[PDB]
Amino acid sequence: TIVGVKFNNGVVIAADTRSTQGPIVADKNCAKLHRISPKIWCAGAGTAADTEAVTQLIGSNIELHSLYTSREPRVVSALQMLKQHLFKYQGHIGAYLIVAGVDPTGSHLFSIHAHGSTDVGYYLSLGSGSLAAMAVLESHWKQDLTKEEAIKLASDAIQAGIWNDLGSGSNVDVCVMEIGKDAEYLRNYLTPNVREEKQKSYKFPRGTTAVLKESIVNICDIQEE
Amino acid sequence: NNYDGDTVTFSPTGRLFQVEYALEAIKQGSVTVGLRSNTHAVLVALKRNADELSSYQKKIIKCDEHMGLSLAGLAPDARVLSNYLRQQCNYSSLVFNRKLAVERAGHLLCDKAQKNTQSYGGRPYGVGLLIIGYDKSGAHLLEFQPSGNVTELYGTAIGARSQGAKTYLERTLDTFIKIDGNPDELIKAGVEAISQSLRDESLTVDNLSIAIVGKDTPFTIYDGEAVAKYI
Amino acid sequence: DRGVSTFSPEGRLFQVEYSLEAIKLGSTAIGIATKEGVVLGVEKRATSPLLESDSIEKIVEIDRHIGCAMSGLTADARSMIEHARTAAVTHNLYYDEDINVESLTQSVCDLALRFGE
Amino acid sequence: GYDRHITIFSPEGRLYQVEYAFKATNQTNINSLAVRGKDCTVVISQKKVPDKLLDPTTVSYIFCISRTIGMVVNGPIPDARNAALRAKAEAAEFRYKYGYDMPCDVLAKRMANLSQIYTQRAYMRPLGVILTFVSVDEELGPSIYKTDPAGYYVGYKATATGPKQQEITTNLENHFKKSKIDHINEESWEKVVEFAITHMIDALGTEFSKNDLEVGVATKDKFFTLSAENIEERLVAIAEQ
Amino acid sequence: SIMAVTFKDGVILGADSRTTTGAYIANRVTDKLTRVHDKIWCCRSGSAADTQAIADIVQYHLELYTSQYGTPSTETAASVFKELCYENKDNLTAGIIVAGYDDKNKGEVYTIPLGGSVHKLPYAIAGSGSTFIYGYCDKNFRENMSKEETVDFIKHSLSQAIKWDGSSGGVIRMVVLTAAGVERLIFYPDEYEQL
Amino acid sequence: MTDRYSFSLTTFSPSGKLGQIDYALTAVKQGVTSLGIKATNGVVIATEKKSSSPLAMSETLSKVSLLTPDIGAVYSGMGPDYRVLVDKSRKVAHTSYKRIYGEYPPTKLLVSEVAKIMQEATQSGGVRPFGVSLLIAGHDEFNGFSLYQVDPSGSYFPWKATAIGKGSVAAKTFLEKRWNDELELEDAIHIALLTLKESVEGEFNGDTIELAIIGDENPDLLGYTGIPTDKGPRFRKLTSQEINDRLEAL
Amino acid sequence: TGYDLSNSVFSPDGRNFQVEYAVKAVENGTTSIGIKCNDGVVFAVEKLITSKLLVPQKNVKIQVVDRHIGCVYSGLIPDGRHLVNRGREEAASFKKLYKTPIPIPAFADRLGQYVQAHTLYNSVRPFGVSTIFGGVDKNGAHLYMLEPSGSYWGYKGAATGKGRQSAKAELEKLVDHHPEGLSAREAVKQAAKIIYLAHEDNKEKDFELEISWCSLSETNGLHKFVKGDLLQEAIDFAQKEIN
Amino acid sequence: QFNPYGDNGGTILGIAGEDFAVLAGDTRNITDYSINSRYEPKVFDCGDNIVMSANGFAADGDALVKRFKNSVKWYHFDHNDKKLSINSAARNIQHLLYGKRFFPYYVHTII
Amino acid sequence: XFLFX
Amino acid sequence: XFLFX
Amino acid sequence: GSRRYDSRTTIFSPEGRLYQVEYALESISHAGTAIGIMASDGIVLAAERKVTSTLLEQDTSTEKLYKLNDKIAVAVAGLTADAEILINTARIHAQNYLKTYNEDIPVEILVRRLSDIKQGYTQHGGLRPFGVSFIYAGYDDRYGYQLYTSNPSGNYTGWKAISVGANTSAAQTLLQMDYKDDMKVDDAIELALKTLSKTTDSSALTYDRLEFATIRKGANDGEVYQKIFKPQEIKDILVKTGIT
Ligand SMILES: [Cl-]
Ligand SMILES: [Cl-]
Ligand SMILES: [Mg+2]
Ligand SMILES: [Mg+2]
């Protein structure tokens, strides 16, 4: 579950922190919020390798472009470079991204699908929990949201995904990008799914395990004298 | 002088010396005559031997059933250009079921020669060609220079002492143009023309080479006892 | 320096005219054609008496019906012979017959002016 | 002495082919001037039609590169048009790839980098042209960036190019020493063009008819050139004060 | 549901605002009317990715055309669309209507189906929703209509297309192309449903 | 067409000299003075903004360039050659390192990559050497602060302090007397300004001098908060005002 | 010195001497002219009759590009043919992508950029032709003249070759005496006269006149050769004016 | 999918006499149950007293006959107008056919 | 899925 | 497997 | 065309010498002297930095001695930049061999490859040769301790003791005089420094003007250690041998 919500003076993106291998939860605290540029962040869904690889590649080329032009990077640049790359690979790079940021042009919120289609909105959601999240956004979104209201709406939309989607879970990560301010990255903004104490300590008595052999491993280089 | 090292260099008077040197190779070449009426077009070529044991270098090449040329200069260059004409004639037949126009054959030779005069590393062609043919607009005679200049003529001659034959044709213009439906008399006029370019040597049976193309006459070459009739 | 494909003011290719000088320095080769056959003879010209003369190969078979004698920089001939043999065999593969002596010669001579930069 | 024929260093550490390319720059015998207003950038250039057989409408050294960027060239027209077509191509490609209009200074840098390559690679000759790029950039505002055959470029408060550049340069220098500001403090572009023409007249000591000048104007979101009649209106205003 | 209609003063482009993945509406406020030049616009139907990629290239080609040869004709814009759609027919799912206003040629509409064929028409309809309004549009279209008449014709037409087609819905967007300039119109459900 | 210059334009002369590299170094000698000084807690690089015209906006021309957040570069010689080298240097830092290891290259390895690009222009077909000497200052976790010189040949050397271009010979003598291993960054800036004043003829102020440091991390220049390990760039270009402040205590 | 041995080398002047030498080849060629009339353009050329053996009206020099553009040139005839071949490719590719036939100014720059490209490298020779070309597009009649350097401008009248000074003087009179403009049929007559007058510089050998025209009214904006009665009428007018 | 082959039917018959040979074929061209032509010649004079017919897919048959006719022309050019013997023609046609071994000519050839 | 009036 | 919100 | 400006870097002189190779060797003769001495129990590499400054950071400096792998090192004489191109090529070949055969590359195989690259630049490509001479110090389990040299020609030869760069004639005479076959590393260290001390064009030989390295089986048991000497360690061995 990834959402983006436009507010008065900026844009806010949120995401859950679960990655899956089939029906198994591989990472209970994944990081789906990526820094393309200091003030351009995007949330990714789909193939985990593809979303990291595609944001890092465009993030690198955006940095070189920014140095070349002596200008702070624009969201439309990151957006254009991402969609032309994804279109080239005809959806085989399974990157579904919500691209947000503030630049000299203002605040922007975009979504980009794996086949290279982009769209513009005040509120977007992508991933398996998009329908759960979009249900909350369609119920509670209004024009002229404050910063505090937009964070609340964004995190509530992620929670909708966490509870009601088996693909989404664990914590809520938020990133607020306000015009004329430093982007604040709120890692684990909410912790609604903290595991309870176990009934028993499964710490074993020492010597429980049967050992065939023991040896020192040499990690040091070839020594002197 | 300083401007003849390669074909990519103009002289201070706007001359291309490598092209002019290529033009010189033609003048050293043996004489060949071309002339036509309205019905037929004739090539007459004086073939050159190395010595008495040697054969007489072939001068006339067939390009299609309706077209062919005579050469003066580097024979290998005539082979490259005649092979190109054969292909272009062939492409026209296969793709468009169309016999290639003699005028368009000229335009294609011109453009092939030109590319070798404007690019570094290459060299101009060292041969001059007389192309005869019969197409949908009747008999044609063309003169090719490796500068790229191609000219349509009633008659002409290229090679050593060619000026003698060219003057004769310039006098006979009104006579030989009217020789319609008489191939033998048109060849006679061609043999009498090339005769004006001879010195010491005369036309023998293995010396003379004649080719003709016309209304109901495919491009055919005559050598040996087939030209004894015209000596 | 100057182009390899350059014409002289007399309308001759410098490099071709110079190669003809290299051939004049070569060992003698003679051919005589008759109605009973064609004879080919060469001077071997060993540089020393320790050189095993029978190893000097200046007469070479191209096909069963075509022989070849050479004079000049004889090392240059190896690739010309190779091409001639390939041409003779290739034509027999494509047409189930012996290749005409003139056609084989023409094939070898098509390599001659394939030089430049 | 082949170190004078291609772009390799001389013993003095010089590139003579670059120096000689700078000399080709003045072959046309035309002088250009560029100044900045509050909201606009103005570029004026001398127009000379020596032949009566010429169609004077086709005789131009000012180019519309993009909707926002204009370019005036000092040098022969073949090299000018070579540079124009390339800048047009580069501006279009930039917009497609990065999703916003190429800035004036970024195009200047790109054309300067291309120029640098001709000074380092032997098989390519330098172009015998100085390129003056003008726009009202959405970030930097009124902008003048100039490129030369060395591959050098810089921003300008104002600039001048051609045989009599030093006379125009000092005239502009003296004005900005008085006003103590980096632009022409004027609302309308019409009056900024009048300033440009007036200070060229004072610097060159020559009067101009409508057919003797060529004017380009950059405003927010478009660059355009003035017609003979648009210049005539400008010349009338100057004479009437 | 997309359509372009030529009237007396110029041309009007109309479209719905719905983007679908299967039966889920991915975007309910899509802008399917896109600018390739100041007074040359297109209507996008088929693949969202393909139509966006095509439209982006055509905008590039016409920007470069303008730099060199000045304002391109609507015919020229249609030709560039066709070239991309025909030569890449195997890999593209794009149905595009090209609409533009010249001063010489006035309002012109070109439709480019899947094949990459070009058809110059007085008016054109395309998309899944178009099938339900073939009868209606043919009976109701007249040449040289007024602006108000043409807006009504498009509003009523797409209103029916949206009503019967699950794949069409949301707001009715329109773009008016005349000598006067470029006007954007929007019509909300409460308005066009009660027609 | 085609680039038919497939052969070297830099060859050995009978004396064993590579002419084009010597001539490139001669071009660097004609160039404006630049210097670098290494302190215990930072590095400073400085040069004169030799404005071609007073109408020219000298701020738009950057002689001191950021290569990575922790690495800066200054030059003496041909400016265009420097600009394209900075573009290639920034790119190679990404393609040959950051896109592989997920971190910026250490100073010595980026220098090594720039050096390689300049060596190739010394041997490759149909090209002349680059007519610049670079001074590259940088910090990395395991090597700490470092300063390198790179010459047209592609040769590079590490320096405690040095100078290149017009008045290098005099400047290097001045630095030898003032430099110790106990210099703080502020002391190195003071010495850098003193050294640079000797080679400058005309105006000597924040507007005519370009100076940058590799020092402490600048979290105020990062552009975002929330990741403790990202503390911001060590490269900072001094403002016009910041230079003028230190010229009063001169 | 040596600055004139290699193409694309700047002399200490800032000149490309190889391009200036190409101009000498052009100056050596036969006279060719172009006249811009009310609704089109007229092209004429001098064809030297070297020998009686030359077939009259057969060795055509003027070349069509697309269906609406006429091209004539003085200098190395093969170099001209090569440039027209490129022009035909450029005109074909333009029409293929943009549908509309290539505008004349657009076509002018296509030749311009191509000729200029042959001054950028020592591996190629500059073009040994000045090319007079033009026709009718959507914006009306256009006449252009293109030099070996890649330099081209629009013209009211254009001339090149051995008789250019004579021609230019006669063109300058027409521009002055007809400010309101010249008709297509008048321009054909005048073209004939100017070639006959410019033949005084090639007076040794007799010549053959060749004229072509593109007019919105007279040819429907297509390039056609002047033939039969209209050609004889122009020759008669020209012959009357020299006597 | 697109099928690059078709069947145009027809039948060809070659009989060799002592001092003569005949090559015969019906003049009917068909597609499915439709008659395309009642007179489309299928047997051709190729020069040098050689008659050829490629029967099956008409498009492949027409292409092969063309290539062989072209092959005869270039034999004359490259071999001083030597007459092409039937055995030499047969070997040449094998090389034409085998050229398209992995995209065959769907024809039955008799000369 | 793939977005598609 | 791969890791896949 | 372009032929006019071609130096023709890969032609023979009338005497049958390669101009560019000969001129490259002339270049190398001006470079700082590098010495290699092979003993029974290890190898020494000593090399002189060219006229240094008091403001050169020596402890982070490397111009002479480079590591190719854990078993092989090189001393450089010539263009440092040219050497680094070849060194990185050699480092890759060593790792290619290890990846393929799962064994460290034998010293000669690495030397032959680098030498074959240099040869190529003299026979084709029309580029200038590499202005570099290497001394290779290496150990493998076939030939044990090995010294080689390669020069711009691409020719390579094996040595018990060798010098490259400046004053090789003088250096080779001094080595040929004092070298014995039964010699040990400690003795070879002393010889290398004494040789440089006498051949140097400098007034005196100090720690700040030297790079020093040993390859010893002086590694705990059956293995080989490479020691690139630190500035303070070079200063200590200069006092020990009694040169300062
Ligand atoms: Cl660039
Ligand atoms: Cl869309
Ligand atoms: Mg150059
Ligand atoms: Mg619906």
Chains K and D touching, counted as 3 or more CB pairs less than 8 Å apart:
yes
Who's near B62: CB < 8 A, 6+ residues apart? B68, B211, B219, B221, H77
| Alpha carbon separation from D62 to B73, B167, D54, D162, G141 (Å, rounded) | 53, 59, 18, 14, 23
- Report whether F159 contacts K57 (CB < 8 A): yes
d(CA F201, CA F199): 7
Output G228-233 pairs: Cβ under 8 A, ≥24 positions apart. Answer: G230/G188, G233/G189
Phi, psi (5° rounding) for residue A111? -120, 145
Give me the phi and psi of K85, to 5 degrees please. Answer: -60, -50
The end-to-end CA distance of chain I, in Å, is: 16
CA–CA separation, B126 vs G161, rounded Å? 28
Is B55 exposed, middle or buried (CB count within 10 Å of its CB: 0-12, 13-18, 19+)?
Answer: exposed
Residues of A in contact with E52 (CB under 8 A): 83, 116-118
Q: What is the distance between the alpha carbons of residues A203 and E111, in angstroms, rounded to a whole number? A: 74
Phi first, then psi, for residue K71 (nearest 5°) are -110, -15
Inter-residue contact C92 to C104 (CB < 8 Å): no
What architecture (CATH level 2) is domain D1-241? 4-Layer Sandwich (3.60)
d(C-alpha F115, C-alpha F138), whole Å: 16
| F229 has a chain A CB within 8 A of its CB | no
**Cα–Cα distance between G87 and G93 in angstroms, integer?**
10
Residue numbers after which chain G is interrupted (C to N above 2.5 A) read none
Q: In this structure, which amino acid lies at residue G101? A: P
CA distance K164 to D77: 58
Q: Provide the phi-psi class of E100: left if phi over 0, else alpha when psi is between -120 and 50, else beta.
A: beta
G121 in contact with D, Cβ within 8 Å: yes
Report the C-alpha gap between K90 and K83 in whole angstroms: 10
Q: Facing residues of B152 across strands?
A: B142
Query: Are G182 and G41 spatial neighbours (Cβ–Cβ below 8 Å)?
Result: no
Which of C40, C42, C48, C94 minimizes the C-alpha distance to C67?
A: C40
3-state SS class at F103: coil
As a whole number of angstroms, the distance between CA A147 and CA A177 comes to: 10
Enter the tokens of residue C93.
């593969």
Task: Calculate how close chain C gets to H56, using CA atoms only, in Å.
Answer: 25
Residue A203 CA neighbour count, 13 Å, CB half? 2
At B173, the amino acid letter reads L
Chains G and H touch (3+ CB pairs under 8 A): no
H104/D63 Cα distance (integer angstroms)? 58
| Region of residue K222 (phi > 0: left; psi between -120 and 50: alpha; otherwise: beta) | beta
* Portion 40-79 of K in contact with A at CB < 8 A: 70
Rounded to 10 deg, the angle between the E48-69 and A75-88 helix axes is 110
Domains of chain K: residue spans and CATH: 1-244 (3.60.20.10)
How far is it, in rounded angstroms, from Cα B220 to Cα B231? 19
The region that residue G66 occupies, defined by phi over 0 for left and psi between -120 and 50 for alpha, beta otherwise, is: left
CATH of the domain at F32: 3.60.20.10
Gap between the Cα atoms of H24 and H41, Å rounded: 10
Chain K residues whose CB is inside 8 A of the A218 CB are none
Q: What is the DSSP letter of B228?
A: G
User: Does G243 reach chain F within 8 Å, measured CB to CB?
Assistant: no
Q: Given an 8 Å threshold on Cβ–Cβ distance, is D13 in contact with F53?
A: no
* Residue written as token pair 């062919």: B68
Residue F112, CA distances (Å) to F29, F116, F119 in order: 23, 6, 10
Question: Which tokens hold the place of E91?
Answer: 């890999």
Give the integer Cα–Cα distance in Å for F57 and F43: 28
D8: CA distance to ligand 3 center in Å? 8
C-alpha–C-alpha distance, residues B133 and G55, integer Å: 15
Return the structure tokens found at C42.
Answer: 């060469």
Contact E124, E109 (CB under 8 A): yes
Rounded Cα gap, residues B187 and E144, in angstroms = 75
Residues 6+ apart with CB under 8 A from G75: G22, G25, G26, G28, G29, G128, G129, G130, G161
Instruction: State whether residue B182 is helix, strand or coil.
Output: coil
Find tokens 């910041």 and name the residue: F242
How buried is residue K206: exposed, middle or buried, by Cβ count under 10 Å (0-12/13-18/19+)?
A: middle
How many domains does the structure of chain F reveal?
A: 1
- Short-list D72, D70, D65, CA closest to D95: D65
d(CA A81, CA D96): 10
The domain ranges of chain D are: 1-241
Strand-pair partners of D156: F56
Query: Of B128, B157, B127, B130, which is closest to residue B141 (Cα–Cα)?
Result: B130
- Taking each helix axis from N to C terminus, what angle separates F79-93 and D104-120, rounded to the nearest 10 degrees? 100
SS3 content of chain D, % helix, strand, coil (to 5): 40, 25, 35
Q: For residue C64, give the DSSP letter.
A: T
Strand stretches in chain E, DSSP E: 2-7, 10-15, 19-21, 24-27, 33-37, 40-46, 94-101, 107-112, 119-121, 123-126, 172-178, 181-187
Do D44 and D193 meet the contact criterion of CB atoms below 8 Å apart?
yes
Residues B23, B145: contact at Cβ < 8 Å?
A: yes
> By the 8 A CB rule, do D112 and F83 touch?
yes
For chain G, what is the HEC assignment?
A: CCCCCCCCCCCCCCCCHHHHHHHHHHHHCCCEEEEEECCEEEEEEEEECCCCCECCCCCCCCEEECCCEEEEEEECHHHHHHHHHHHHHHHHHHHHHHCCCCCHHHHHHHHHHHHHHCCCCCCECCCCEEEEEEEEECCEEEEEEECCCCCEEEECEEEECCCHHHHHHHHHHHHHHCCCCCCHHHHHHHHHHHHHHHHHHHCCCCEEEEEEEEECCCCCCCEEECCHHHHHHHHHHHHHHHC
- Read off φ and ψ for residue A124, nearest 5 degrees: -130, 155
Interface of E with D in 28-87 (CB under 8 A): 56-57, 59-60, 63-64, 66-68
Q: Can you name the residues that pair with K227 across neighbouring β-strands?
A: K214
Distance between CA atoms of residues H80 and B62, nearest Å: 11
Q: Shortest CB distance from B76 goes to which of C5, C9, C113?
A: C113
**Domain containing F123: what range?**
1-249
Question: Beta E107-112 vs D213-219: how paired, if at all?
Answer: unpaired
Element (H or E) spanning F140, and its range?
A: strand F132-140
- Environment of ion ligand 1 (residues, CB < 5 A): D 113
Instruction: Collect all residues of chain A within an 8 Å Cβ-Cβ radius of residue E27.
Output: 119, 121
Contact residues for C78 (Cβ-Cβ < 8 A; gap 6+): none
SS3 E174: strand
Element (H, E) at F88: helix F79-93
- C41, C84, D80, D131 from D158: Cα distances, Å: 88, 75, 21, 14
Cβ atoms < 10 Å from Cβ of E17: 22
Closest CA in chain G for residue E104: G138
Long-range contacts of K100-108 (CB under 8 A, 24+ apart): K104/K69, K104/K70, K104/K71, K104/K140, K105/K69, K105/K72, K105/K140, K106/K140, K106/K142, K106/K143, K107/K71, K107/K72, K107/K136, K107/K138, K107/K139, K107/K140, K107/K143, K107/K146, K107/K148, K108/K143, K108/K146, K108/K148
d(CA D45, CA D215): 6
Give the C-alpha separation, B22 to B118, whole Å. Answer: 14
Tracing tokens 């020719």 back to the chain, one arrives at K155
Chain K: closest CA distance from residue D188 (Å): 55
Measured distance CA(H2)–CA(D146) in Å, rounded: 59
Query: By C-alpha distance, which of F36, F135, F117 is closest to F76?
Result: F135
Exposure string over E135-150, b if 16+ CB within 10 A, otherwise e: ebbeeebeeebebeeb
State the distance from the centre of ligand 3 to the C-alpha of C5, rounded, in angstroms.
Answer: 26
Contact E98, E40 (CB under 8 A): yes
Structure tokens at F120: 């190739």
**3-class SS letters over E87-130:** HCCCCCCEEEEEEEECCCCCEEEEEECCCCCCEEECEEEECHHH
Instruction: Supply G58's token pair.
Output: 């057969």
E strands in chain A: 2-7, 10-16, 19-21, 24-27, 33-37, 40-46, 95-103, 106-112, 118-120, 123-126, 172-178, 183-190
Strands of chain H (E only): list them: 12-16, 21-25, 29-31, 34-37, 44-45, 51-56, 107-110
Contact A123, A4 (CB under 8 A): yes
Strand order in the sheet with K144-150: K65-67, K72-78, K132-140, K144-150, K156-159
Contact (Cβ atoms closer than 8 angstroms) between residue K35 and residue K195: yes
Alpha-helix residue ranges (DSSP H) falling in chain D: 16-24, 77-98, 104-120, 165-179, 189-204, 228-239
**CA proximity to D90, closest of D77, D79, D104:** D104
Helix (H, G, I), strand (E, B) or coil at H52: strand
Catalytic site positions of G:
30
Q: How far apart are CA A182 and CA A148, in angstroms?
A: 16
Report yes or no: K93 and K105 within 8 Å, Cβ to Cβ: yes
Q: Least CA distance to E27: which residue of chain I?
A: I3
**Per-residue tokens: E167:** 């794949």
SS3 K221: coil
* CA–centroid distance for E175 within its chain: 9
Q: Are B124 and B7 in contact (CB under 8 A)?
A: yes
Closest CA to E123 of E140, E105, E139, E108: E108
> Which parts of chain A fold into alpha helices (H)?
48-69, 75-88, 130-140, 147-164
- How is residue C3 written in tokens? 């182009």
The CA-atom distances, in angstroms, between K111 and each of K73, K148, K149 are 11, 8, 8
Amino acid identity, position A77: S
* Structure determination method: X-ray
Asked if F170 contacts F198 with a C-beta cutoff of 8 angstroms, the reply is yes
G229 reaches D (C-beta below 8 A)? no
Distance (Å) of CA D223 to CA D43, D142, D160, F180: 11, 12, 19, 58
Beta-strand relationship, F56-57 and K210-216? unpaired
Interface test with E, best of G94, G98, G137 (most E CBs within 10 A): G98
Asked whether the beta carbons of residue G123 and residue K1 sit closer than 8 angstroms, the reply is yes
Q: What gap in Å lies between CA A63 and CA A74, rounded to an integer?
A: 11
B197 CB neighbour count, 10 Å cutoff: 22
Q: Do chains G and B touch (3 or more CB pairs under 8 A)?
A: yes
**Domain annotation for chain G: domains and CATH numbers:** 1-243 (3.60.20.10)
In chain B, what are the domains? 1-231 (3.60.20.10)
The helix (H) or strand (E) run that includes residue F86 is helix F79-93
Place of tokens 């104490």: A197
The most distant pair of C-alpha atoms in chain E lies apart, rounded to whole Å, by 50
Spacing, Cα E21 to ligand 2 middle (Å): 12
Q: Which amino acid is at A29?
A: N
Question: Cβ neighbours of residue D78 under 8 Å, at least 6 residues apart?
Answer: G112, G115, G116, G119, G149, G150, G151
The CA distance from E180 to D135, in Å, is 27
Q: Measured between alpha carbons, how far is D3 from D14 in angstroms, rounded to an integer? A: 9
Phi-psi label, residue D151: left if phi above 0, alpha if psi -120 to 50, beta otherwise: left
Specify which residues A95 forms β-bridges with.
Answer: A46
Backbone φ and ψ of H49, nearest 5°:
55, 40
Does any CB of chain A come closer than 8 Å to the CB of residue K218? yes
Output the six-digit token pair for K194: 């004494």
One-letter amino acid at G175 equals: V
| Separation CA H64–CA H70 (nearest Å) | 10
The amino acid occupying position D136 is: V
CB contact under 8 A, E72 and G98: yes
Sheet with G140-146, strands from edge to edge, namely G63-65, G69-75, G129-137, G140-146, G152-154
